[PDB]
From a paper:
The structures presented here are part of the [name] 630, R20291, and Y384 sets nominated at CSBID. The overall success of structure determination for [name] in both CSBID pipelines was 7%, with a total of 23 unique structures and eight variants or ligand-bound proteins determined.
Author numbering: 40 to 288
Amino acid sequence: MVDYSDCFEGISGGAIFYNTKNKEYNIYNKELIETRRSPCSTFAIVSTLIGLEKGVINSKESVMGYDGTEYPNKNWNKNLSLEEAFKESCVWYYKKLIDKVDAKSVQNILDDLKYGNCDISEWEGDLKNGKGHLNGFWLESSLQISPKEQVQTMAKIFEGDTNFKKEHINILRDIMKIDVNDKNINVYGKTGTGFDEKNKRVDAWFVGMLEREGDTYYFAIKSDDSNKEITGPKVKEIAINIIKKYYSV
Ligand SMILES: [Cl-]
């Protein structure tokens, strides 16, 4: 077990890195890394592949059709492409996408990916939050997955061990790339932000992979802090600092 607590600056959380080469896990906070939680918008990694496999989308430019709804997040207020929906965590785009897939197809794909509890029973999500259609089974609802299960899922997808087409995985890699001000390393990832009302803790995520020289690491960074200021973007900042201090040369 490793200690990346310095990069969390007192925020409650954990981190797990996996190298498919030597099959070794680098684990900070084992109990937290093994606890299942809602994936929130990190589910966009898998929903993007489901949409491509089923022909609901076909490229980084694919649009889903904007109905003119004025959302609080003004970055959602247009007919945005797959790459923009991924980067802006656009829930309306991904709900309209998954609504065009039979639950049985989603169930079979999650079961084959071993995506945590694979529970999509609350399809429409938790309507008790008053958000209406801005909800889904992957947003503080029935679907739950641990940080370790996220990295096991990432490894199977990007090492070619799933049924997804390599062409579709390459589209996902492209939209997952993030700029970290260091051409020597390639970082890919998706943020997730939610609040677990029952337990009064955030679900703040940054899930992805690091490609450095001759090594690839699949990673999941997670916070369960009490402070609602702790969001996916903040956990992404922590992830980049962990990568800079413990995964550089
Ligand atoms: Cl360490």
